[PDB]
Design a protein around this motif. Structure first.
Motif, PDB file in Angstrom:
ATOM      1  N   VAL A   1      10.701  -0.828  -1.494  1.00  9.90           N
ATOM      2  CA  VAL A   1      11.811  -0.068  -0.941  1.00  9.90           C
ATOM      3  C   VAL A   1      12.977  -1.018  -0.753  1.00  9.90           C
ATOM      4  O   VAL A   1      12.796  -2.218  -0.523  1.00  9.90           O
ATOM      5  CB  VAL A   1      11.453   0.606   0.393  1.00  9.90           C
ATOM      6  CG1 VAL A   1      10.359   1.617   0.193  1.00  9.90           C
ATOM      7  CG2 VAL A   1      11.015  -0.420   1.374  1.00  9.90           C
TER       8      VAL A   1
ATOM      9  N   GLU B   1       6.368   2.751   4.309  1.00 12.80           N
ATOM     10  CA  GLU B   1       5.757   1.435   4.308  1.00 12.80           C
ATOM     11  C   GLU B   1       5.284   1.038   2.922  1.00 12.80           C
ATOM     12  O   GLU B   1       4.857   1.871   2.124  1.00 12.80           O
ATOM     13  CB  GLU B   1       4.590   1.371   5.288  1.00 12.80           C
ATOM     14  CG  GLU B   1       3.887   0.035   5.236  1.00 12.80           C
ATOM     15  CD  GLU B   1       4.818  -1.112   5.542  1.00 12.80           C
ATOM     16  OE1 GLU B   1       5.845  -0.901   6.226  1.00 12.80           O
ATOM     17  OE2 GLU B   1       4.557  -2.224   5.040  1.00 12.80           O
ATOM     18  N   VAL B   2       5.391  -0.248   2.637  1.00 13.07           N
ATOM     19  CA  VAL B   2       4.813  -0.831   1.441  1.00 13.07           C
ATOM     20  C   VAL B   2       3.340  -0.465   1.378  1.00 13.07           C
ATOM     21  O   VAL B   2       2.631  -0.530   2.388  1.00 13.07           O
ATOM     22  CB  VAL B   2       4.979  -2.354   1.441  1.00 13.07           C
ATOM     23  CG1 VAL B   2       4.315  -2.956   0.213  1.00 13.07           C
ATOM     24  CG2 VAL B   2       6.434  -2.734   1.524  1.00 13.07           C
TER      25      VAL B   2
ATOM     26  N   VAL C   1      -4.986  -0.545   4.924  1.00 16.60           N
ATOM     27  CA  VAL C   1      -4.872   0.472   3.889  1.00 16.60           C
ATOM     28  C   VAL C   1      -6.228   0.562   3.204  1.00 16.60           C
ATOM     29  O   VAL C   1      -7.140  -0.204   3.532  1.00 16.60           O
ATOM     30  CB  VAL C   1      -3.755   0.116   2.887  1.00 16.60           C
ATOM     31  CG1 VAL C   1      -4.156  -1.098   2.071  1.00 16.60           C
ATOM     32  CG2 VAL C   1      -3.377   1.301   2.010  1.00 16.60           C
TER      33      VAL C   1
ATOM     34  N   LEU D   1      18.031  -6.594  -0.244  1.00 17.78           N
ATOM     35  CA  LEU D   1      16.838  -7.102   0.410  1.00 17.78           C
ATOM     36  C   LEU D   1      15.749  -6.039   0.359  1.00 17.78           C
ATOM     37  O   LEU D   1      16.028  -4.839   0.413  1.00 17.78           O
ATOM     38  CB  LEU D   1      17.160  -7.526   1.845  1.00 17.78           C
ATOM     39  CG  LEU D   1      17.784  -6.479   2.766  1.00 17.78           C
ATOM     40  CD1 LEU D   1      16.741  -5.629   3.480  1.00 17.78           C
ATOM     41  CD2 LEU D   1      18.714  -7.153   3.757  1.00 17.78           C
ATOM     42  N   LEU D   2      14.504  -6.501   0.251  1.00 16.84           N
ATOM     43  CA  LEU D   2      13.349  -5.614   0.203  1.00 16.84           C
ATOM     44  C   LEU D   2      12.825  -5.367   1.604  1.00 16.84           C
ATOM     45  O   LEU D   2      13.490  -5.702   2.588  1.00 16.84           O
ATOM     46  CB  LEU D   2      12.239  -6.201  -0.666  1.00 16.84           C
ATOM     47  CG  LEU D   2      12.346  -5.920  -2.162  1.00 16.84           C
ATOM     48  CD1 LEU D   2      13.544  -6.626  -2.742  1.00 16.84           C
ATOM     49  CD2 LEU D   2      11.078  -6.326  -2.900  1.00 16.84           C
ATOM     50  N   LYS D   3      11.645  -4.770   1.705  1.00 16.23           N
ATOM     51  CA  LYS D   3      11.013  -4.561   2.995  1.00 16.23           C
ATOM     52  C   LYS D   3       9.588  -5.071   2.916  1.00 16.23           C
ATOM     53  O   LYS D   3       8.849  -4.719   1.998  1.00 16.23           O
ATOM     54  CB  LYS D   3      11.043  -3.089   3.385  1.00 16.23           C
ATOM     55  CG  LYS D   3      10.378  -2.736   4.680  1.00 16.23           C
ATOM     56  CD  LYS D   3      10.668  -1.279   5.009  1.00 16.23           C
ATOM     57  CE  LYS D   3       9.911  -0.813   6.234  1.00 16.23           C
ATOM     58  NZ  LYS D   3       8.463  -0.673   5.930  1.00 16.23           N
ATOM     59  N   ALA D   4       9.218  -5.907   3.874  1.00 21.00           N
ATOM     60  CA  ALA D   4       7.929  -6.569   3.816  1.00 21.00           C
ATOM     61  C   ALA D   4       6.804  -5.569   3.995  1.00 21.00           C
ATOM     62  O   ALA D   4       6.981  -4.491   4.567  1.00 21.00           O
ATOM     63  CB  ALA D   4       7.835  -7.650   4.886  1.00 21.00           C
ATOM     64  N   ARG D   5       5.634  -5.939   3.495  1.00 25.38           N
ATOM     65  CA  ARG D   5       4.451  -5.110   3.624  1.00 25.38           C
ATOM     66  C   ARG D   5       3.819  -5.282   4.993  1.00 25.38           C
ATOM     67  O   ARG D   5       3.844  -6.370   5.573  1.00 25.38           O
ATOM     68  CB  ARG D   5       3.453  -5.465   2.538  1.00 25.38           C
ATOM     69  CG  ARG D   5       2.132  -4.765   2.619  1.00 25.38           C
ATOM     70  CD  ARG D   5       1.396  -5.182   1.398  1.00 25.38           C
ATOM     71  NE  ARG D   5      -0.007  -4.815   1.347  1.00 25.38           N
ATOM     72  CZ  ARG D   5      -0.749  -4.983   0.260  1.00 25.38           C
ATOM     73  NH1 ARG D   5      -0.196  -5.490  -0.832  1.00 25.38           N
ATOM     74  NH2 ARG D   5      -2.030  -4.643   0.260  1.00 25.38           N
ATOM     75  N   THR D   6       3.212  -4.209   5.485  1.00 27.03           N
ATOM     76  CA  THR D   6       2.750  -4.167   6.855  1.00 27.03           C
ATOM     77  C   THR D   6       1.548  -5.072   7.059  1.00 27.03           C
ATOM     78  O   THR D   6       1.019  -5.688   6.134  1.00 27.03           O
ATOM     79  CB  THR D   6       2.343  -2.751   7.231  1.00 27.03           C
ATOM     80  OG1 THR D   6       1.842  -2.738   8.575  1.00 27.03           O
ATOM     81  CG2 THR D   6       1.269  -2.260   6.284  1.00 27.03           C
TER      82      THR D   6
ATOM     83  N   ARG E   1      -0.671  -3.225   8.712  1.00 23.99           N
ATOM     84  CA  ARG E   1      -1.494  -2.038   8.864  1.00 23.99           C
ATOM     85  C   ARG E   1      -2.511  -1.943   7.740  1.00 23.99           C
ATOM     86  O   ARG E   1      -2.181  -2.138   6.569  1.00 23.99           O
ATOM     87  CB  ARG E   1      -0.616  -0.792   8.870  1.00 23.99           C
ATOM     88  CG  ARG E   1      -1.374   0.500   9.045  1.00 23.99           C
ATOM     89  CD  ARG E   1      -0.426   1.673   8.984  1.00 23.99           C
ATOM     90  NE  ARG E   1       0.556   1.624  10.061  1.00 23.99           N
ATOM     91  CZ  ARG E   1       1.536   2.505  10.212  1.00 23.99           C
ATOM     92  NH1 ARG E   1       1.659   3.513   9.362  1.00 23.99           N
ATOM     93  NH2 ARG E   1       2.392   2.385  11.218  1.00 23.99           N
TER      94      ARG E   1
END
Ligand SMILES: [Zn+2]
Ligand SMILES: [Zn+2]
Ligand SMILES: [Zn+2]
Ligand SMILES: [Zn+2]
Lengths: 46, 48, 1114, 67, 216
Positions: free
Chosen positions: C849, C796-797, A41, A32-37, A39
């Protein structure tokens, strides 16, 4: 969506606890990946 | 020449062995974990 | 449009490759293995019993892969691409039926699992095998990966096709001094074994066989070969009158002066001088102790019972060696391929496997032993599931092997190294590029001039372009486009079949024989040397192309050596092309309409007798033309196409035939290093270092080969507008110069996906490792030293992330390192944390990641960074034509010319590049390009052909540019007419590895190695550089002392030693320590390297006690 | 991946024309340059990228996360 | 650990930025070091039998594909009982088994004693008795606890068909923990109630399977 991460094949959003499970719910699939915030940029186009 | 030290060629066969200082041939450190890398001189003479 | 001989032949090679794939050479081998080999390989050992228990046995029957006998194709297995992320090995379990004995009335079979076999992509048993565009998608992997490689531990490796010196045929090489070493070295299954032969001295000739004692007079052995002639013996190997008469006879002389009548004498002269039976089964100690091994010592090749076959074979060996032993030349050299037979991947896997499984079974005996040691009650219980515990040394050991690159064969005790590689992905080309590459080996030391020259026989069967300088432990070569490597066929049918032609047994023959006609040879083994060679060959070659034994099983004759040769041997290079029928081809020019129609397939020519595969020796016999334009009734064959001569990579070179080979070399060697598309799967795969290109483009011109490998669908490079001029005298040597607000508009822009991996490993302390973090002081913000991660405490992405900071936090306990006990209360809470900093010379981003786990159920995080490098000054742009160059100064916009349409010559190259380096293909290619943009076509110009030049002029003149590429331009600075017209027009340039920004490296004060405390080595770890001998000696010739005293003294190791005048040695602080002293010491400076040298010496027994002197006072 | 917004030399807006170009190629069988001739590119520098730049991004979308 | 020669700063930050790698406290400005040194590139009564101990262990261990890790963990336990001389007078199999078993139990991973005991003639009172005894001589106490939620996964891998099973798995779990809730969970084998729930939800999955295939 807003929550923490995504499946690989399922593309199904899921959140997790610590030392909890590697599997998602719906997938008999592991990675599984990790979602983008949400937050903010920045880039500069030049 | 037999001045003193060379006290005649009874030197040239080993009756006692100089051990290399640790600084010369260190056992490679533990480097993240319990794996401790040997060093051959240390091992060979330490069998001697 | 009717089909045209000029046009038609072209459709063949693609249609040839249309079915039979680009890489079968790693495929059809591997496929052949999973059917032929293992079904035979166990059929070697199907039965085992320990010495005990008269009634027991274990009987192998079935070998399969991925079928438990449920469905045909394996019902399920893990997806390969997905596996590439999990760091597993992509493999299928083995299913094996064994019916066997355990106890009274069992003899029961099951299906059993010995372990898993590390399968290969796009095999018979691959998942992707027969997969259309959907199982691709859902299975998350690109269609255009050529396959033909393994993947283990999540990394990606290839068996490199190993060229091996051809095995089991007589080779004899003339040599100065000496006496011309001859050899034939034979291997079948058991015992690969070598026997050289040669003269000892001055006509006096003897056997060396490391098995035998040594130095045996040969003709004596020839008697021992059972032939008693002593007349024909000469007469056979000798000749009729001519020269040879005397030459050999001296042997017979010394052969006669000792003994005779081998039946005991000679024979038990060999059994008398020979190595012992090695203890057991020396019961054969006899006169015929040797008579057994007389057959088996040198040759497994023949053996049988009476010797006349083997005998006359050995005699034939003697013939050729005395032949040119008469006169030099007239000897075989190892140059032509026929004496070098490479062997593809599949065979290697069996050779390795069967010995692995060998050790397996052998120790499995030892396993069931401890069962039958102590017979408490009734023990049967099959002891089968004990195969599990005893398994997978076959499996996992095989993984470790194929990943290693080193093979240990415990049957032969022979060990080969560098057997595999990491697949190279810098491009799309690189992938298939290192595939279809050829490693060499052996050839004794390097200085022998053998491994040097590139021979004429190499035509079309090896790439005539790239043979790079990576020589080292071998020699790299490449297959052409069309090369089939014919596997072994079979023996007996061709044997008795040649007899069906009516060839005579050796036994029926006149003794004196070789006088008559030439000879017949099976794999180098003569039978009859039948009468009437020509019509023989005609009929035979006919039968091949017609009724039987297609592909190889070729035939080639010889005059100098009187013979003809037919082989079944495997591992041979074959190339197709067209047989001429009488004065013209066999196709009759209408049959390709009968091809393009869609019902032909391929090999239909073969089975219907038009074209077929060939061989060096074969084609060395035949006579081939170039084009159908030039054809003679005296001819034999004709090539399909000229442009099959160059290989896959080399095909990229436009108009190669207009450029000197030195250029095609570097151009092929670099082309594999370009950057570009990779594959459609791109953004879903994660690599250690994987480049790409931001805006890829088709090269304006096509070489027909590009369409064949589906190249342009994966472009790597930029299609660029280029002028040739001296502008901005930064140009000079090979230095290119660019346009800003072009690279600004975007151009050449790059991204580099790198990765970092962390294995979270648990500890026997029962204590895992923690990824927590993000301390966030003040409530103000996560500390800038850290920050940047997220609530999880991990990168973080899509965030700008900078040197000094942490994108992943790994921490282990401090007590985790030690020996645990089951005595604890509260705190595991001690954590030594080693969050890995991202170092680097610039900003970076994290777009992916991965939190995932391998087989062993332990948490794992492998992540990746990307940074888009602007193709800034210092970078390497190439020409695809063989121009290796570095971008120089970058010019803003206004400057460099514009002309009538104001086009800006984005990449402005150098005149002196071309002529003195002399490559016109780039130059003409330009004209081809500026043409292409007109009529709006991708354009040919393929090798030896494609687009003519003369037409393109007319193609331009109508649109009103020079019939050269030349044009007026205007001063980018001064703004007026340039004095000389300038050849320019769009071309195609690309960006390689060797980004400047990686390699720029500097060290102020860096670390010192544990040993020498100096400047730790290379780049990476940290800086410091190498001043070696040859460089150092230079500064002598300037007489400079102080450059040395600074260089190898102060800033190398700045060090003091405490020494003592009396009994000079090296102490420290206040002691000479041999003399309790605290006085005579003199503090001084020496290289710490030098102290190291002493202490080493003095650690051994030796003492360079020092003498000292006043530096001052004269 | 995408039609570049401008060519590396001219810097006329390219992006607009890629869509309409492909439209004129699929429907209305017609010659490449002749299309661009009335499509408004009279100078080759711009023109290449219309003749060039294989469109990958869809061939990527095959692998899109949701499938 | 050390402290500045002057400023008396105890907090040391090592700058790797410029590739000097120089450690300095933010309290002084003086490095305490220059250029940190870094690395580069069986005759016994007990220990021979210890090579035997890992050998037989490591061998019989991963025949079940149990973690390479946990095996290493159990080895040190065999050394623990070896110290107590628990290893003297009993069949080595019963020992080496129990050793491994306490680990996986302590790590609560999916295997069962009755499951794991089977790789021999074991009556399972043999090994169970052994393990029970090394407990009598070891003060290791509460760690080996069990639930079926572990087992059901490893069971499903043997159950084939499709992935509705997984959906069904969540079925059984709510079932299982409810049966734990309904108080019938106690006093019976985890395997039994495990395959119990597995069945009940398969009957909920409208499939045809057999008690045979279950006890399998
Ligand atoms: Zn899922
Ligand atoms: Zn002294
Ligand atoms: Zn333009
Ligand atoms: Zn300080």
């Amino acid at each position: 969506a807003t929550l923490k991460y995504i499946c690989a094949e399922c593309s199904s959003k899921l959140s997790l606890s610590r030392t909890d499970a590697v599997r998602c719910k719906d997938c008999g699939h592991r990675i599984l990946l990790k979602a983008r915030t949400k937050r903010l940029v920045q880039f500069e186009a030049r | 020449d037999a001045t003193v030290p060379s006290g005649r060629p009874e030197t040239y066969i080993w009756r006692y062995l100089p051990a290399p200082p640790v600084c010369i041939r260190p056992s490679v450190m533990m480097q993240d974990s319990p794996a401790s890398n040997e060093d051959d001189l240390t091992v060979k003479l330490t069998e001697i | 449009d009717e089909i045209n001989t000029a046009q038609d032949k072209w459709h063949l090679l693609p249609a040839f490759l249309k079915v039979k794939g680009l890489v079968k050479q790693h495929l059809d081998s591997f496929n052949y293995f999973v059917d032929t080999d293992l079904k035979k390989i166990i059929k070697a050992n199907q039965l085992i019993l320990s010495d005990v228990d008269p009634e027991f046995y274990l009987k192998y029957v079935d070998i399969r892969v991925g079928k438990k006998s449920s469905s045909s194709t394996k019902d399920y297995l893990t997806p390969p691409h997905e596996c590439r992320l999990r760091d597993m090995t992509y493999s299928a379990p083995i299913y094996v039926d064994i019916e066997y004995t355990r106890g009274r009335n069992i003899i029961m079979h099951k299906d059993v699992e010995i372990g898993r076999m590390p399968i290969m992509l796009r095999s018979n048993k691959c998942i992707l095998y027969d997969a259309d565009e959907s199982k691709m998608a859902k299975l998350n992997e690109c269609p255009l990966d050529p396959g033909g490689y393994f993947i283990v531990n999540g990394t990606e490796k290839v068996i490199l096709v190993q060229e091996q010196l051809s095995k089991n045929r007589i080779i004899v090489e003339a040599d100065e001094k000496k006496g011309i070493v001859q050899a034939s070295v034979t291997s079948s299954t058991h015992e690969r074994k070598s026997k050289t032969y040669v003269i000892t001295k001055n006509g006096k000739i003897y056997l060396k066989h490391n098995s035998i004692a040594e130095e045996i007079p040969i003709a004596i052995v020839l008697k021992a070969c059972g032939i008693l002639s002593d007349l024909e013996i000469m007469q056979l190997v000798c000749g009729n009158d001519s020269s040879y008469q005397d030459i050999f006879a001296v042997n017979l002389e010394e052969s006669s002066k000792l003994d005779i009548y081998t039946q005991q004498q000679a024979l038990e002269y060999i059994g008398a001088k020979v190595k012992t039976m090695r203890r057991q089964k020396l019961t054969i100690l006899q006169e015929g102790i040797e008579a057994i091994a007389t057959t088996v010592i040198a040759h497994l090749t023949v053996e049988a019972l009476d010797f006349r076959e083997k005998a006359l074979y050995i005699a034939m060996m003697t013939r050729r060696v005395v032949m040119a032993m008469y006169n030099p030349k007239m000897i075989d050299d190892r140059d032509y391929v026929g004496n070098k037979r490479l062997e593809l991947a599949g065979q290697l896997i069996s050779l390795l496997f069967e010995d692995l499984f060998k050790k397996f079974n052998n120790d499995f005996k030892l396993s069931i032993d401890k069962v039958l040691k102590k017979p408490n009650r009734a023990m049967e219980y099959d002891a089968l599931l004990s195969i599990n515990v005893h398994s997978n040394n076959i499996t996992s050991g095989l993984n470790r092997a194929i990943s290693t690159g080193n093979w240990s064969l415990k049957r032969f005790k022979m060990e080969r190294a560098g057997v595999t590689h990491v697949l190279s992905r810098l491009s799309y080309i690189s992938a298939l590029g290192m595939m279809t590459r050829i490693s060499s080996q052996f050839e004794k030391s390097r200085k022998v001039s053998g491994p040097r020259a590139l021979q004429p026989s190499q035509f079309g069967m090896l790439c005539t372009a790239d043979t790079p300088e990576g020589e080292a432990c071998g020699l790299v070569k490449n297959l052409a486009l069309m090369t089939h490597i014919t596997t072994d066929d079979e023996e007996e049918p061709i044997k008795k079949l040649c007899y069906v032609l009516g060839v005579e047994d050796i036994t029926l023959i006149d003794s004196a024989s070789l006088h008559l006609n030439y000879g017949v040879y099976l794999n180098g083994t003569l039978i009859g040397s039948i009468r009437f060679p020509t019509k023989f060959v005609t009929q035979f070659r006919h039968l091949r192309r017609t009724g039987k034994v297609s592909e190889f099983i070729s035939i080639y004759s010889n005059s100098h050596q009187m013979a003809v040769h037919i082989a079944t041997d495997g591992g041979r290079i074959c190339r197709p092309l067209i047989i001429v029928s009488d004065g013209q081809s066999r196709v009759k020019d209408i049959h390709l309409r009968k091809l393009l129609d869609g019902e032909l397939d391929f090999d239909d020519f073969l089975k219907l007798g038009l074209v077929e595969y060939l061989d060096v020796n074969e084609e060395n016999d035949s006579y081939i033309a170039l084009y159908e334009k030039d054809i003679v009734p005296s001819m034999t064959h004709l090539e399909i196409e000229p442009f099959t001569i160059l290989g896959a990579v080399a095909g990229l070179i436009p108009y190669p035939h207009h450029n000197q080979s030195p250029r095609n070399t570097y151009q092929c060697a670099m082309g594999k290093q370009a950057i570009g598309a990779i594959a459609y799967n791109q953004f879903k795969r994660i690599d250690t270092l994987l480049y790409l290109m931001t805006y890829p483009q088709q090269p304006m011109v096509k070489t027909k080969t590009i369409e064949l490998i589906d190249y342009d669908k994966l472009p790597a490079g930029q299609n660029a507008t280029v002028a040739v001029m001296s502008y901005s005298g930064y140009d000079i040597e090979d230095a290119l110069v660019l346009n800003k607000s072009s690279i600004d508009r975007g151009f050449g822009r790059c991204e580099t996906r790198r990765k970092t991996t962390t294995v979270l490993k648990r500890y026997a302390n029962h204590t895992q490792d923690i990824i927590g973090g993000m301390r966030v002081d003040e409530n103000g913000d996560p500390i800038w030293q850290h920050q940047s991660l997220g609530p999880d405490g991990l990168g973080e992405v899509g965030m700008k992330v900078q040197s000094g900071q942490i994108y992943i936090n790994k921490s282990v306990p401090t007590n985790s390192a030690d020996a645990p006990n089951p005595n604890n209360v509260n705190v595991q809470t001690q954590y030594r944390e080693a969050p890995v900093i991202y170092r680097g010379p610039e900003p970076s981003h994290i777009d992916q990641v991965m939190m995932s786990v391998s087989d062993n159920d332990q948490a794992l995080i492998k992540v990746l960074l990307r940074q888009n490098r602007r193709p800034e000054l210092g970078d390497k742009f190439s020409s695809r034509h063989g121009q290796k160059g570095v971008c120089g100064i970058i010019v803003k916009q206004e400057d460099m010319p514009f002309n009538d349409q104001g086009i800006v010559p984005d990449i402005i190259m150098n005149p002196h590049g071309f002529p003195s380096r002399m490559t016109v293909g780039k130059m003409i290619e330009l004209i081809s390009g500026k043409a292409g943009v007109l009529n709006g076509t991708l354009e040919y110009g393929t090798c030896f052909g494609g687009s003519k030049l003369e037409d393109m002029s007319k193609i331009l003149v109508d649109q009103g540019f020079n019939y050269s590429g030349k044009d007026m331009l205007y001063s980018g600075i001064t703004g007026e007419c340039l004095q000389a017209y300038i050849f320019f027009g769009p071309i195609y340039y690309q960006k390689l590895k060797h980004m400047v920004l990686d390699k720029m490296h500097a060290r102020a004060r860096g670390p010192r190695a544990v040993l020498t405390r100096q400047p730790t080595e290379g780049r990476s770890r940290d800086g410091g550089l190498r001043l070696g001998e040859m460089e150092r000696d230079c500064v002598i010739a300037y007489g400079a002392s102080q450059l040395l005293l600074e260089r190898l003294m102060i800033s190398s190791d700045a060090f003091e030693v405490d020494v003592c005048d009396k009994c000079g040695l090296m102490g420290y602080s206040g002691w000479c320590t041999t003399c309790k002293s605290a006085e005579n010491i003199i503090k001084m400076t020496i290289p710490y390297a030098a102290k190291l040298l002493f202490q080493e010496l003095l650690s051994m027994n030796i003492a360079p006690r020092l003498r000292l002197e006043d530096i001052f006072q004269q | 991946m995408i039609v570049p917004v401008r060519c590396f030399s001219c810097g006329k807006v390219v992006g607009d024309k890629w869509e309409s170009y492909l439209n004129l190629l699929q429907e209305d069988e017609l010659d490449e340059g002749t299309a661009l001739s009335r499509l408004g590119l009279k100078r080759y520098c711009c023109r290449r990228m219309i003749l060039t730049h294989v469109d990958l991004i869809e061939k990527f979308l095959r692998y899109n996360p949701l499938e | 650990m050390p402290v500045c020669k002057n400023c008396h700063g105890t907090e040391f930050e090592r700058d790797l930025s410029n590739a000097n790698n120089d450690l300095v406290c933010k309290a002084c400005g003086v490095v305490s070091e220059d250029n940190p040194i870094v690395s580069e590139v069986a005759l016994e009564s007990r220990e021979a039998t210890l090579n035997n101990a890992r050998r037989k262990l490591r061998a019989v261990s991963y025949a079940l594909h149990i973690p390479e890790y946990i095996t290493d963990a159990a080895f040190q336990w065999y050394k623990l009982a070896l110290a107590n001389n628990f290893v003297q007078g009993r069949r080595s199999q019963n020992v080496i088994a129990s050793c491994l078993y306490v680990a996986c139990r302590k790590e609560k991973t999916h295997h069962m004693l009755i499951d794991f005991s089977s790789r021999l003639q074991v009556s399972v009172y043999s090994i169970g008795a052994t393990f029970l005894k090394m407990v009598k001589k070891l003060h290791i106490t509460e760690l080996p606890l069990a639930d079926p939620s572990l087992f059901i996964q490893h069971f499903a891998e043997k159950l084939d068909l499709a992935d509705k099973k997984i959906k069904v798995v969540k079925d059984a779990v709510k079932l299982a923990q409810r049966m734990s809730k309904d108080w019938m969970f106690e006093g019976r084998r985890p395997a039994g109630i495990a395959g119990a729930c597995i069945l009940l939800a398969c009957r909920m999955n409208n499939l045809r399977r057999t008690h045979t295939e279950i006890v399998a």
